[PDB]
Amino acid sequence: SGAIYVGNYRVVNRHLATHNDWANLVWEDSSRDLLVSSTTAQGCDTIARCDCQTGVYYCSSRRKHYPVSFSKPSLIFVEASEYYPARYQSHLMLAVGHSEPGDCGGILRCQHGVVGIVSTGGNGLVGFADVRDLLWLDEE
Numbered sequence: 001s002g003a004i005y006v007g008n009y010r011v012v013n014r015h016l017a018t019h020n021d022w023a024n025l026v027w028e029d030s031s032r033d034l035l036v037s038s039t040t041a042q043g044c045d046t047i048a049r050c051d052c053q054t055g056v057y058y059c060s061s062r063r064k065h066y067p068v069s070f071s072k073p074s075l076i077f078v079e080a081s082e083y084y085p086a087r088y089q090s091h092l093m094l095a096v097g098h099s100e101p102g103d104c105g106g107i108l109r110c111q112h113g114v115v116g117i118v119s120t121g122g123n124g125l126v127g128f129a130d131v132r133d134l135l136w137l138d139e140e
């Protein structure tokens with residue numbers, strides 16, 4: 001579990017969105033595993049606007065933040081899990097690192113701010129769903 005709180009938005013994995021998220025929906029995209037809902041209070045996270053390929057992510061199954069090198073956002077072939085059938089997930093970045101289903105949520109960050117959130121893994125690999133191209137998160 002885990003979310004990004006920026007301005008009056010809450011960014012979560014689409015497959016982990018609650019009824020309150022769907023009842024206060026701003027935007028969702030199944031191909032990216034992302035959903036954004038509105039919040040009453042303002043959040044403290046800042047979104048990175050960059051092309052960094054090194055950062056640090058939070059892994060709840062280890063209670064640790066790991067430094068990682070990660071690929072550029074791409075259309076990444078992901079095998080069946082409890083939530084999506086094997087398919088092609090877009091705007092996905094991969095890194096070598098430990099992860100369990102429960103970790104989805106965890107923030108990947110660089111020197112500029114939040115880059116994305118865990119979205120996939122297995123095989124000793126993890127994927128984050130990128131958010132750096134969602135410029136509208138910084139306003140309205």
Ligand SMILES: CSc1ccccc1CC(=O)N1CCc2nccc(O)c2C1
Pocket residue numbers: 077078079080081082099100101103104118119120121122123126127
């Ligand atoms: C951070 S989510 C996660 C973490 C640890 C393990 C599995 C997942 C779920 C997932 O994404 N799957 C399910 C199984 C799996 N296994 C091997 C190759 C895969 O493509 C997939 C895709």
Ligand SMILES: [Zn+2]
Pocket residue numbers: 048049050051052110111112113
């Ligand atoms: Zn950066």
